[PDB]
Structures are given as structure tokens and as C-alpha cells.
Coordinates of C-alpha atoms (C1' of nucleotides) and ligand atoms in Angstrom, one line a residue:
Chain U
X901 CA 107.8 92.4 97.1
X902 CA 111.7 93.5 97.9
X903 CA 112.5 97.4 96.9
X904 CA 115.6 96.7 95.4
X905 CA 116.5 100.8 94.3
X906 CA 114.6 103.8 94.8
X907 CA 115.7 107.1 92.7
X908 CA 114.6 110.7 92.1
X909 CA 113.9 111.9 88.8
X910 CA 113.0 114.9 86.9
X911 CA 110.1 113.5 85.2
X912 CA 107.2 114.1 88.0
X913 CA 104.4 111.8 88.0
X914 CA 101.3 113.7 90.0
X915 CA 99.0 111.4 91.8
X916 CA 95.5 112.9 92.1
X917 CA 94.9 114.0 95.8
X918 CA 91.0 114.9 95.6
X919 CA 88.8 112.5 96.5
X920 CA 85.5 112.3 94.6
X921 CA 83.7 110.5 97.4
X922 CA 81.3 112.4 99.7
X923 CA 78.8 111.6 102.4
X924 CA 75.1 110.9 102.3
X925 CA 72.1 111.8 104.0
X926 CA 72.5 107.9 105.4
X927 CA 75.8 109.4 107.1
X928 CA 74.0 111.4 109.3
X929 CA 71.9 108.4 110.0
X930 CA 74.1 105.9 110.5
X931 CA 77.4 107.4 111.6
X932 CA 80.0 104.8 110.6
X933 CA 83.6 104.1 111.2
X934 CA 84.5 104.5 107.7
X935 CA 85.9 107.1 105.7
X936 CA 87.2 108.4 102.3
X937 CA 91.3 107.0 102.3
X938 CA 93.8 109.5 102.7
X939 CA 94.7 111.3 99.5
X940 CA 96.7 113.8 100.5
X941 CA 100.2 113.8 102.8
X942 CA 98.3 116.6 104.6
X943 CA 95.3 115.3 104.9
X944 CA 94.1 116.3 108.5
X945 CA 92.1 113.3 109.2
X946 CA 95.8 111.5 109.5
X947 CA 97.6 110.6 112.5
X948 CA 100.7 113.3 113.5
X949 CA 103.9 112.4 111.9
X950 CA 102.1 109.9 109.6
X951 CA 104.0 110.2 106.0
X952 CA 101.8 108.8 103.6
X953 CA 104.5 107.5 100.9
X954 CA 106.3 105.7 103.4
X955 CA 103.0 104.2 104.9
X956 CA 102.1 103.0 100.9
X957 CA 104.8 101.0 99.9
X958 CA 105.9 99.7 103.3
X959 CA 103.9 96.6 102.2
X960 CA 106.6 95.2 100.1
X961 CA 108.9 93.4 102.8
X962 CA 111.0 91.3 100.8
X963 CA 111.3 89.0 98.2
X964 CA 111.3 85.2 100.3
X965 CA 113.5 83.2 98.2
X966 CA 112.9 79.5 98.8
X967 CA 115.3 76.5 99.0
X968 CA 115.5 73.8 96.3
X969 CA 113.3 71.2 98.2
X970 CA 110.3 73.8 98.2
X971 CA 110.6 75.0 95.1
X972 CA 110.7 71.6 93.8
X973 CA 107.9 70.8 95.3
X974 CA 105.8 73.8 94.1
X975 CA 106.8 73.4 90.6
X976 CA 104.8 69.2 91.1
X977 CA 102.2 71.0 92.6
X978 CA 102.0 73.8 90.5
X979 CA 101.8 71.1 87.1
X980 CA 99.2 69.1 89.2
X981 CA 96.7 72.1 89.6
X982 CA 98.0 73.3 85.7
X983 CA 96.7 69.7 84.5
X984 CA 93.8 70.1 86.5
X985 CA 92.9 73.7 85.1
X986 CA 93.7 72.5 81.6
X987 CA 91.6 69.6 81.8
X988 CA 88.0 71.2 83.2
X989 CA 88.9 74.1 80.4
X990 CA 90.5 72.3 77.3
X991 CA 93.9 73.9 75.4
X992 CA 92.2 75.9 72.9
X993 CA 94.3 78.9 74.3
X994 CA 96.0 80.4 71.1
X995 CA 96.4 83.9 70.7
X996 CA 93.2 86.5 70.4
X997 CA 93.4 89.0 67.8
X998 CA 94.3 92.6 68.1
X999 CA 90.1 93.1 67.1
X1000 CA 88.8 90.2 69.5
X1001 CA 91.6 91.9 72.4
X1002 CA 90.4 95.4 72.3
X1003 CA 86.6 94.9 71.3
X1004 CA 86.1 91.2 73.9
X1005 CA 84.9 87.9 73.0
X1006 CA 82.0 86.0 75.3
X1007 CA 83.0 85.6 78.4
X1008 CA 85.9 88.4 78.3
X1009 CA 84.8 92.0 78.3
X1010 CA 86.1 94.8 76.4
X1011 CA 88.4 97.1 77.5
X1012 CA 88.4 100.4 79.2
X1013 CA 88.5 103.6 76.9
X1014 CA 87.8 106.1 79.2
X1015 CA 90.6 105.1 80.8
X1016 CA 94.1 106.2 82.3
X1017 CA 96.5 104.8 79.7
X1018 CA 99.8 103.9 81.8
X1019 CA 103.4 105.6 81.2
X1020 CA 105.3 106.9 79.2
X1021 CA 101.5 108.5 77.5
X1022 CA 100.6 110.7 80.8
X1023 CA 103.9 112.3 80.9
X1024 CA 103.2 112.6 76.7
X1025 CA 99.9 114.2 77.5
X1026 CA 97.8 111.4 75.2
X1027 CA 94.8 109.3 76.6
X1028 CA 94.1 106.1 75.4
X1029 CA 91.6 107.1 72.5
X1030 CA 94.2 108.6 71.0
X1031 CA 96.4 105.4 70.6
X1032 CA 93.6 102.9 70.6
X1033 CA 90.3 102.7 68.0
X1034 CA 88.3 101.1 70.5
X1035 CA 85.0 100.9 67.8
X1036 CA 86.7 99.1 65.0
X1037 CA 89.4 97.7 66.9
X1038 CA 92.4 98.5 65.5
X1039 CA 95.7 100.8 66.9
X1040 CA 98.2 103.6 65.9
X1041 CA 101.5 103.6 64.9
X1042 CA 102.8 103.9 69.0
X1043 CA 100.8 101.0 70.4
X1044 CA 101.9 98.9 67.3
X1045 CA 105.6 99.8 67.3
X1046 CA 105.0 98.4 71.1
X1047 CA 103.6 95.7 70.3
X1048 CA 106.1 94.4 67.7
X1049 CA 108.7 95.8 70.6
X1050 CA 106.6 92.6 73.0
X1051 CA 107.2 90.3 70.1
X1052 CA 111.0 91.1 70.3
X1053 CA 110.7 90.6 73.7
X1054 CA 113.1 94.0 74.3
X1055 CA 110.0 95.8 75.6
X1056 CA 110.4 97.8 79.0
X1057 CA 107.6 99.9 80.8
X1058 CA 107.1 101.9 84.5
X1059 CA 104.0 101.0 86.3
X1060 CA 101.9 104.3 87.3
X1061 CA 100.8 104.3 90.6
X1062 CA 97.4 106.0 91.7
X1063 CA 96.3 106.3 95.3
X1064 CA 93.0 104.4 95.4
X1065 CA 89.7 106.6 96.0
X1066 CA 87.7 104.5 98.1
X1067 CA 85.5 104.2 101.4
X1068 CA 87.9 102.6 104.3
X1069 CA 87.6 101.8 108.1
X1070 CA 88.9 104.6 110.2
X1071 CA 91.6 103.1 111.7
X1072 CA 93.2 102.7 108.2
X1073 CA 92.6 106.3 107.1
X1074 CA 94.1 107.7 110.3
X1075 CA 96.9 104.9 110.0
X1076 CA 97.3 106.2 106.2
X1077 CA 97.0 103.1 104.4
X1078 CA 95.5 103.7 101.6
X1079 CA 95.7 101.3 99.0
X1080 CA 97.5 101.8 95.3
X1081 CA 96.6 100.8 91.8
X1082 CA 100.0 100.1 89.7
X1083 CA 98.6 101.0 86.1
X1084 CA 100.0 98.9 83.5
X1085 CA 100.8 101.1 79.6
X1086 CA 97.6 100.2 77.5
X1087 CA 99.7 98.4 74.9
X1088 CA 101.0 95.8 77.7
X1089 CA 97.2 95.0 78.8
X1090 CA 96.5 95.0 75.4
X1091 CA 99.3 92.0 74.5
X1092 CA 98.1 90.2 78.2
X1093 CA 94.7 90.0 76.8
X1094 CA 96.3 88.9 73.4
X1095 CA 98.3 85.8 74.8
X1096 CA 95.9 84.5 77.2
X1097 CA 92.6 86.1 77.2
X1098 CA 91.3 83.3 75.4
X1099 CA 91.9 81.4 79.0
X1100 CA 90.8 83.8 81.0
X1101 CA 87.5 84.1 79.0
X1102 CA 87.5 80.4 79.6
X1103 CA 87.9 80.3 83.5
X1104 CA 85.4 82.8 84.0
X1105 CA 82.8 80.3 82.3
X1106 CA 84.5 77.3 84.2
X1107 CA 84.3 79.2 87.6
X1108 CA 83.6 76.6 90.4
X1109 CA 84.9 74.6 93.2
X1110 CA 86.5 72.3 90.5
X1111 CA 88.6 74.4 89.2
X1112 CA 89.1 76.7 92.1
X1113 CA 88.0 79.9 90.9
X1114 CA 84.8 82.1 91.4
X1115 CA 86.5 85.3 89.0
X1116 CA 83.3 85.4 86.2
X1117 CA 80.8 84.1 89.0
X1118 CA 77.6 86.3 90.1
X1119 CA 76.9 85.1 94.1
X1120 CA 73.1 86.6 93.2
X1121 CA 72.6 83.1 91.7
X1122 CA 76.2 81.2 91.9
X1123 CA 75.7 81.4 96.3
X1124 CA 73.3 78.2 95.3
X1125 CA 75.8 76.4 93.6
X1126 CA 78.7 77.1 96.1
X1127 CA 76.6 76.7 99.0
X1128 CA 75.1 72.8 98.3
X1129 CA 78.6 71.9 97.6
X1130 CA 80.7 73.1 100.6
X1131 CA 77.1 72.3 103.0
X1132 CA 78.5 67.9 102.2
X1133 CA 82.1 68.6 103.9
X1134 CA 82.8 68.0 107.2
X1135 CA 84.9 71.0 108.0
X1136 CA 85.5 74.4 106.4
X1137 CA 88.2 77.2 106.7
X1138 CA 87.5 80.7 106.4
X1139 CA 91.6 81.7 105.6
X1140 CA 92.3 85.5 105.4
X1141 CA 96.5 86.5 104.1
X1142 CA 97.9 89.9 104.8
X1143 CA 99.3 92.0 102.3
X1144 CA 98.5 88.8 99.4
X1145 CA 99.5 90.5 96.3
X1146 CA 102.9 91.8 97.7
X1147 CA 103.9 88.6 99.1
X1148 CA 103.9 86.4 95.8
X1149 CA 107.7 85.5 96.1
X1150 CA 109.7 85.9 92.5
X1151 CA 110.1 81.7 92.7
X1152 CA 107.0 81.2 92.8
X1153 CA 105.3 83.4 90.6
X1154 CA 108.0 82.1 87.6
X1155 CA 107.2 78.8 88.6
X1156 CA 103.4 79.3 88.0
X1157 CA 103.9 81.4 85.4
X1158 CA 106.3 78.3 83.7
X1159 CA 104.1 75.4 84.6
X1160 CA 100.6 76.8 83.6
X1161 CA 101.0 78.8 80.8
X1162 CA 103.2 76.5 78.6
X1163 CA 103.0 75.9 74.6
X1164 CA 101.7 72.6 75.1
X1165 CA 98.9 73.8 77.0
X1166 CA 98.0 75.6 73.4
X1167 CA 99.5 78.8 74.5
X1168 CA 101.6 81.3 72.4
X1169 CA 105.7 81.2 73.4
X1170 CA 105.2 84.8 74.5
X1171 CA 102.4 84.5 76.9
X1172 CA 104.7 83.2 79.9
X1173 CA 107.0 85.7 79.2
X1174 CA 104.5 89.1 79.4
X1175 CA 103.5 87.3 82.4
X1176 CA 107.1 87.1 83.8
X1177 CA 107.3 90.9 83.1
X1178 CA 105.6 90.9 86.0
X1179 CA 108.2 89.7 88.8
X1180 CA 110.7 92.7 88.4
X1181 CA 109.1 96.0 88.1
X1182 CA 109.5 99.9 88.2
X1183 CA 107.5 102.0 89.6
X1184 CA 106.7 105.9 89.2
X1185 CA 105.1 108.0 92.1
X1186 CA 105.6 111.6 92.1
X1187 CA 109.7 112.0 91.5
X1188 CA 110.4 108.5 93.0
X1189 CA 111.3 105.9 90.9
X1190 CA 111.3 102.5 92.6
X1191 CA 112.7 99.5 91.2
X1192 CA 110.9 96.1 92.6
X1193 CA 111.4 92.4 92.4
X1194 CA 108.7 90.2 93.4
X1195 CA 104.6 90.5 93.9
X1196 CA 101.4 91.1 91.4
X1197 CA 100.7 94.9 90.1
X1198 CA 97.1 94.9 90.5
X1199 CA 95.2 96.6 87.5
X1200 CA 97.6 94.4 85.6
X1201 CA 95.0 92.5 83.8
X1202 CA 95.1 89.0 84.8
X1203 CA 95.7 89.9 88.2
X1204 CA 92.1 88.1 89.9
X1205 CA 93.0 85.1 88.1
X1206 CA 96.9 85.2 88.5
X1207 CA 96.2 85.9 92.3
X1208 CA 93.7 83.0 92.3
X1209 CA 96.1 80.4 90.4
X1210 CA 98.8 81.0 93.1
X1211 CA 96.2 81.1 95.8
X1212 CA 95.3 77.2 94.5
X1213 CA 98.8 76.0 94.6
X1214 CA 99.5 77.7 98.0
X1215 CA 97.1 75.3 99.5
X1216 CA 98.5 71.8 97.2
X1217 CA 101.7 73.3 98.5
X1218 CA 101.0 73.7 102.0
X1219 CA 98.7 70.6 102.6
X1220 CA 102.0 68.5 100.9
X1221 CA 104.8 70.2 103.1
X1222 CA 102.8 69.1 106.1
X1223 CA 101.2 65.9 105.0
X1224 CA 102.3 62.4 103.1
X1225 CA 100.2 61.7 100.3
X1226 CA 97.7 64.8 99.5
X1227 CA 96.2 64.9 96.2
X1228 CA 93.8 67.8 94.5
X1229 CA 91.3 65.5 95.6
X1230 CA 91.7 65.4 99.7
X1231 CA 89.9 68.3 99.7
X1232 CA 88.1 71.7 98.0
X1233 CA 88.6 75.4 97.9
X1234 CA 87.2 78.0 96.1
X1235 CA 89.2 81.9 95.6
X1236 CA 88.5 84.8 94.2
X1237 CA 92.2 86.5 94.1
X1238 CA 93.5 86.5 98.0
X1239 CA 89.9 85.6 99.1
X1240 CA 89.7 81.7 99.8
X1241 CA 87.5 79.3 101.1
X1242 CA 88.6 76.0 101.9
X1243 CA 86.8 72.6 103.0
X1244 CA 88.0 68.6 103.7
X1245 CA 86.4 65.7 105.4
X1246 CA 89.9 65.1 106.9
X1247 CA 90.4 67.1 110.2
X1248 CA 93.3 69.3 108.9
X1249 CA 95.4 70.9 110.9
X1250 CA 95.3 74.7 109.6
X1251 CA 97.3 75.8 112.6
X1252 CA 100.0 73.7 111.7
X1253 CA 99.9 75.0 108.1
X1254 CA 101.3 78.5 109.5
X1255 CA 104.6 77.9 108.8
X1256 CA 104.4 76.2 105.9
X1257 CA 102.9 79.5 104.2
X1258 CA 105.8 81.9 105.5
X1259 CA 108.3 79.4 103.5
X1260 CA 105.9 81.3 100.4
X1261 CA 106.3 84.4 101.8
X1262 CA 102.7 84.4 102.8
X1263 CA 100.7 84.7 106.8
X1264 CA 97.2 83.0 107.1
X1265 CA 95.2 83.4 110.1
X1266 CA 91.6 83.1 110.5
X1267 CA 89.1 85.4 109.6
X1268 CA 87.4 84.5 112.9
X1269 CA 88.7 86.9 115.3
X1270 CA 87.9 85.4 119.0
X1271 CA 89.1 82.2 118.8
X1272 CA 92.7 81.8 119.3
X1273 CA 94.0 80.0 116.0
X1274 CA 92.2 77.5 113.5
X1275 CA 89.5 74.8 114.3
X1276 CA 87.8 72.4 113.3
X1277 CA 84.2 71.9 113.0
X1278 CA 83.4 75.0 110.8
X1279 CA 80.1 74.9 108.5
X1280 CA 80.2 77.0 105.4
X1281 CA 77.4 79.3 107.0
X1282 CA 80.0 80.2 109.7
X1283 CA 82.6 81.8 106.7
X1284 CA 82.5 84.8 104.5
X1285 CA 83.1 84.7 101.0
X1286 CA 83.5 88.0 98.4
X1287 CA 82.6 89.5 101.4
X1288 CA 79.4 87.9 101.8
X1289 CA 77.6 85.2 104.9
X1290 CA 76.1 82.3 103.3
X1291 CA 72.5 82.2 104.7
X1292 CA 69.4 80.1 103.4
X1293 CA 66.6 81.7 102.4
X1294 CA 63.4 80.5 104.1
X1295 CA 61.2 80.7 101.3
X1296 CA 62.7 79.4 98.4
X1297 CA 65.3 77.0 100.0
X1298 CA 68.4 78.5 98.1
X1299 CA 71.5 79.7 100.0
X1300 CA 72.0 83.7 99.5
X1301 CA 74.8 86.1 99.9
X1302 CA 73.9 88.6 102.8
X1303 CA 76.4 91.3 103.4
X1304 CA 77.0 92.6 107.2
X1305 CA 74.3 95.4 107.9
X1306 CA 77.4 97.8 109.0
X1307 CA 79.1 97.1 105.5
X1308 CA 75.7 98.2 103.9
X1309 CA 75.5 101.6 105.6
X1310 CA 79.4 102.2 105.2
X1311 CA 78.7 101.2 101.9
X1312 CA 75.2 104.1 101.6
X1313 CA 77.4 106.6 103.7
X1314 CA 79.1 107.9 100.9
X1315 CA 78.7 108.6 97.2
X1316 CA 80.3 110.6 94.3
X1317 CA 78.8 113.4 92.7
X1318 CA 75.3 112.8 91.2
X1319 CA 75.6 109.4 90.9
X1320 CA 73.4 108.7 94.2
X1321 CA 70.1 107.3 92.4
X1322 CA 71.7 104.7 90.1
X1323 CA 74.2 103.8 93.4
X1324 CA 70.8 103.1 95.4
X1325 CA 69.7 101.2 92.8
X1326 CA 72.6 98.7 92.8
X1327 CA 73.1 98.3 96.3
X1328 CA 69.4 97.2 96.7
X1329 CA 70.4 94.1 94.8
X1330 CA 72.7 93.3 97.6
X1331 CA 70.7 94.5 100.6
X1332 CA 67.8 92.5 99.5
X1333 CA 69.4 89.6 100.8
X1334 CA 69.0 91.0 104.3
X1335 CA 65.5 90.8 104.7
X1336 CA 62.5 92.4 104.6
X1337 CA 63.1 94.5 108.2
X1338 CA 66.6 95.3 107.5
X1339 CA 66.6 96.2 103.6
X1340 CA 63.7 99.2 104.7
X1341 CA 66.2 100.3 107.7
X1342 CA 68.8 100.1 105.2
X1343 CA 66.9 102.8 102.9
X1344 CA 64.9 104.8 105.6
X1345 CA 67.3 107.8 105.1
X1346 CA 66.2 108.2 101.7
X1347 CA 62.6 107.8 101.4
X1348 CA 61.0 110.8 99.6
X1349 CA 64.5 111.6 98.3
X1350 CA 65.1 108.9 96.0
X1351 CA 63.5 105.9 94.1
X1352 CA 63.4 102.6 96.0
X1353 CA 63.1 99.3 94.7
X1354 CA 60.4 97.3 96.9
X1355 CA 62.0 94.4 98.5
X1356 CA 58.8 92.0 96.7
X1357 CA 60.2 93.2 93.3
X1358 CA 64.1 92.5 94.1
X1359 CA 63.2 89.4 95.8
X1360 CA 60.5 88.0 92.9
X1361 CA 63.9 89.2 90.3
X1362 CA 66.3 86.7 92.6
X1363 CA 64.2 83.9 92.6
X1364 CA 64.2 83.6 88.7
X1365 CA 67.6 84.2 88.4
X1366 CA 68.8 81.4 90.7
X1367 CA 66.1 79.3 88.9
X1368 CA 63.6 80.0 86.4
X1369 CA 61.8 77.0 86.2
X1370 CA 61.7 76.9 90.1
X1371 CA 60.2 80.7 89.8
X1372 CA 57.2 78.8 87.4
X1373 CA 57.3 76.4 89.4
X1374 CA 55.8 78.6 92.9
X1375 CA 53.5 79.7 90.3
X1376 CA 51.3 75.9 90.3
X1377 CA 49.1 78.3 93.7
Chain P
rA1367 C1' 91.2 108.0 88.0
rU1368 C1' 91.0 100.3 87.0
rG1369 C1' 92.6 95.4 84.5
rG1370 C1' 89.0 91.4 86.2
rG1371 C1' 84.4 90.0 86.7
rC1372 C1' 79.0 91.0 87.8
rC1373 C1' 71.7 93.1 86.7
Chain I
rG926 C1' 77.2 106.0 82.1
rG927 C1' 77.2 104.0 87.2
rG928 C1' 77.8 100.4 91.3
rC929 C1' 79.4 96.2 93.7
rC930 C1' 83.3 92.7 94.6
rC931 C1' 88.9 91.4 93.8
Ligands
LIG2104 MG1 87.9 85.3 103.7

RNA sequence: AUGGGCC
RNA sequence: GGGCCC
């Protein structure tokens, strides 16, 4: 995004500075390059001279304003990929209830209670709860005066932003980059969900390579699916952006917002415009008040799926700009917000696509780091997807997601408070994947201290999920 | 202390 | 209630 005006203000917004991460007895083990982010301006762990507010928001860059031609040409491929979308899903995208928004329908979970609740409540000194009835579904009289404020459409808010608590590499936490969550007021999540959580309910059931989405998928069994289908194409692209969410120029993201969620489309008048909301925003961190125009607010609501619509018509866009006569058809892709995988039988130039992504405001380069540029001749066991290696299993024949050993132990290194034993637990599912050798080094350093899942009782668990006729199947020995 | 998924 | 990924 572009930081159009920053401002100090009386009305202090604290940002917690306590991380709730700490180390493991697989830290000692293991000794990775990864730490807790930087919380605190005087965090220790940082670089001399290293101000961490500056560091945060130096993401946004500007606001890349294209010409006529290009954004003529994003708004054809932006309808293309809409009609596309709206074809694989259908147009029964009317509004959900206040009941259905709060409490979830299949395929959309419910929302957050124990939650932060967004500005101006903080400052007010009122949690969610006390606004929302999250049991029977219903609101008070401040999220429903703000809600008829959205149907007005003369409803302003201030994005809160949080400094994320999470496990980073090392060079990032001594470079201070610790990323931010902008947090949305309740009652705005509340109306996103309203206008189109219908259609995001719908994509998450409709997640595939046809429609270009994996937000809803679970790669425990979905890697199967995925796998088989980029395995038939003669290259793939593993493309990584910098700084993704920031970078969404103001043209384009009205553009999307204009061409996909329209009233033909059986959407509610009001759902592009919540959307739009989006594009200019104000942020509050601390006594700074900074006014932006351009980029996605992540925790927004949408923002997986919004960040994985534009990632689609990035590559329509790009592949057009460069090439005569490039449908949805001359190739495949498959994103989950910035991440992307991309495949064609054509020998696409990648490299030459460069250029054609700065016009959006966007840099691609590989994710393969050697190798001087893009190439051809990639497999989809070379890439990395959700940040997973596509690798067949052996026994069953099914492709599987297995995670790079050093992101496991970065991953067991650290843990909050008491919550150790039910961690373990989860990241066994993902570790499993390893094999047999490296799951058991994986959980060496807490044998006798913790419970264990064997690697036969994951492993037996995966095979029926993937397939359970395939599971009774291997039981005709 | 996080909308989005996902045992 | 927790974890993973975005
Ligand atoms: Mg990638």
C-alpha cells in the first residue's frame, strides 16, 4: 500500500509486547535458527539502531496506479476468471442471516468469541461477548446500530494492529520484521460474512485446480488430488511474491471487487461495497494514526480467498500482457492466498513475465533459490505448496505432503504455556509424512516426557482418509 | 491476542 | 480448548 498521512493522537492503542511462546526440550536438541518475533522496540535479540515501527509498516511502498490499457485488460480478465468462478460454484450467493453469520453454515465456520473485537470497543473497554450472543446468534444495540450504519453505507472504522506472536527465522527477528495483524471491528466481519459468506462457504467446497483455490482443502488427503493432476503437465512453476498482501494496487483490487462480486452474480448491492472498504484504510498503532490507500488487511475475513481471487487474475493478466491469445484454459494453477502453483504444456516464459507483474505492483521470482531465474522443465515433486514437498508414498501409491525436517524441529522448538501435549499431538499428523526414521528423530527429545502417537497408527489413520475403500481394500491379505 | 480454512 | 497453514 501508499501511506498517504500519518498523525498522533491522544487515544493510545497498546500493542501487546510479551510473547507467549517459549522453547522446548527439542530446542536444546535441535538448536534452530528460528526464534520468537520481536515484540518489543527493545527487544535485545534486535539489531542496534533497528526501530521496530519503522521496520513494520515499511512494507507499504506505494500504491502502483496502472494505465488505461492494463486496467482494461484486467477488468476482461478479471470477468473471465469471475464467469469461471461463478460457473464451477452457481449464483446462489444472497445474503446469510445475522443467525447463519455469527453461528456458520456447512462449509463456513463460526466465528471467534474469545476474540479481540476491533476499535472503537478496546479503547471502550468491551470484548466481543459483550456485543455479540454468540449461542443464539443474535446482537446488541452497538453492533446493530452498526450494522444499519453498513446498510447506509456512511460506516467508517480504524483497523487495530497487533504485532504477530509467532516462531520466525533469525535473520527476520534480528532484522525486526515481525509481521502484523490489522483487526477488523466485529460488526464489519460480521456484515463480510453476511454479504458473501454464502460464496466463501461455497469455494471452500469447490476448492481445486478448476477453480484455482485450495482455501477449505486438507493436503492430508487433498495432496492425492492435487498431485495426479499437476503429475499430466509438462512444466510447473513454483512462484513466490514479496510483500503480496501490501502490493494489491487500489485498481486492481476495485476492479476485482467490481467484476466478481456483482448483483447478477446473485450477490447483495452491498457486498462489493464492504469489500471496497477495504482499498482506503486507517490504521491505529500505539498514538500513530496512519491513513492508507491500497493493499488487503489480513484478519479481514475474506482475506485467503480475496488474496487468492487476485492471485488468479494476476496470472490471466500476466500470461495476456505477454502473449496473443491465452485463455483460462492454456494452463492451471492452484493458490492458497499469495501461495501459487502454476503448470502448462506450453513452455512459458516465466522470466519474461517479470515485468509484467511490477505493472500490478507485484515481484515474482522463484522459490528455487540456485538457479538464476525461471525454467522450464519443473515436475510438481520439485515445488512446495502450503509449505509442503509433494512426495509419493511407497506403500500406498498416493502423493503426501512432507514438510522440510528443519521446519518440523523449528516448528517443536517452541511452545506456549501448557499447551505442549495437545501441540505434539498435532504436529505428529504432519511429521508422519516424513517417514518412519525421521518422524522418531523428530520426537526423540520427548520420549518419557510426553505421549507419542506411533507412526503405524498415524499412517493406518492417513490411508483411510485419502481413501477408505482403498484402506479395505489392503485388507483382501 | 486472528478472519480463513483444516483431525 | 489447542495446533497447523494463509
Ligand atoms: Mg510457493
Amino acid at each position: 500500500g501508499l501511506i498517504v498521512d500519518t498523525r498522533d493522537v491522544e487515544e493510545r492503542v497498546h500493542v501487546m509486547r510479551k510473547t507467549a511462546l517459549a522453547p522446548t526440550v527439542a530446542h536444546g536438541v535441535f538448536n534452530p535458527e528460528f526464534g520468537p518475533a520481536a515484540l518489543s522496540n527493545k527487544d535485545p535479540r534486535l539489531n542496534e539502531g533497528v526501530v521496530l515501527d519503522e521496520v513494520i509498516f515499511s512494507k507499504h511502498k506505494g500504491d502502483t496506479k496502472m494505465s488505461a490499457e492494463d486496467k482494461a485488460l484486467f477488468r476482461r480478465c478479471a470477468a473471465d476468471y469471475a464467469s469461471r468462478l461463478h460457473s464451477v460454484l452457481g449464483t446462489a450467493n444472497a445474503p446469510l442471516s445475522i443467525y447463519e453469520a455469527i453461528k456458520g453454515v456447512d462449509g463456513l465456520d463460526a466465528m471467534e468469541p474469545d476474540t479481540a473485537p476491533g476499535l472503537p470497543w478496546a479503547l471502550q473497554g468491551k470484548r466481543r461477548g459483550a456485543l455479540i450472543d454468540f449461542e443464539n446468534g443474535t446482537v446488541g444495540p452497538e453492533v446493530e446500530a452498526a450494522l444499519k450504519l453498513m446498510e447506509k453505507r456512511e460506516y467508517k472504522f480504524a483497523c487495530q494492529t497487533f504485532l504477530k506472536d509467532e516462531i520466525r527465522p533469525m535473520e527476520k527477528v534480528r532484522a525486526g520484521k515481525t509481521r502484523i495483524v490489522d483487526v477488523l471491528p466485529v460488526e464489519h466481519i460480521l456484515y463480510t460474512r453476511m454479504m458473501i459468506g454464502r460464496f466463501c462457504a461455497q469455494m471452500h467446497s469447490n476448492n481445486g485446480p478448476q477453480i484455482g483455490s485450495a482455501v477449505g482443502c486438507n493436503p492430508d488427503v487433498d495432496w492425492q488430488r492435487f498431485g495426479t493432476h499437476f503429475a499430466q503437465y509438462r512444466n510447473v512453476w513454483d512462484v513466490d511474491y514479496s510483500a503480496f498482501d501490501a502490493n494489491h494496487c487500489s485498481d486492481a483490487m476495485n476492479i476485482m471487487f467490481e467484476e466478481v462480486f456483482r448483483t447478477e452474480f446473485g450477490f447483495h448491492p452491498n457486498a462489493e461495497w464492504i469489500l471496497k472498504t477495504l482499498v482506503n484504510t486507517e490504521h491505529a498503532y500505539e498514538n500513530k494514526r496512519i491513513t492508507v490507500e491500497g493493499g488487503m488487511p489480513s484478519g479481514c475475513s475474506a482475506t485467503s480467498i480475496i488474496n487468492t481471487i487476485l492471485n488468479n487474475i494476476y496470472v490471466l493478466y500476466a500470461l495476456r500482457r505477454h502473449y496473443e491469445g491465452v485463455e483460462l484454459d492454456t494452463y492451471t494453477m492452484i493458490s492458497y492466498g499469495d501461495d501459487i502453483v502454476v503448470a502448462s504444456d506450453y513452455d512459458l516464459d516465466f522470466e519474461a513475465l517479470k515485468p509484467h507483474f511490477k505493472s500490478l505492483g507485484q515481484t515474482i521470482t522463484p522459490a528455487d533459490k540456485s538457479d538464476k531465474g525461471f525454467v522450464l522443465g519443473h515436475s510438481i515433486t520439485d515445488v512446495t505448496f502450503l509449505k509442503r514437498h509433494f512426495h509419493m508414498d511407497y506403500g500406498t501409491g498416493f502423493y503426501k505432503p512432507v514438510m522440510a525436517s528443519k521446519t518440523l524441529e523449528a516448528i517443536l522448538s517452541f511452545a506456549r504455556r501448557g499447551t505442549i501435549q495437545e501441540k505434539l499431538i498435532s504436529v505428529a499428523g504432519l511429521a508422519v509424512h516424513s517417514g518412519p526414521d525421521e518422524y522418531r528423530r523428530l520426537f526423540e527429545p520427548f520420549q518419557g516426557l510426553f505421549e507419542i502417537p506411533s507412526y503405524r497408527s498415524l499412517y493406518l489413520r492417513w490411508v483411510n482418509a485419502v481413501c477408505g475403500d482403498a484402506a479395505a481394500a489392503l485388507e483382501h491379505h
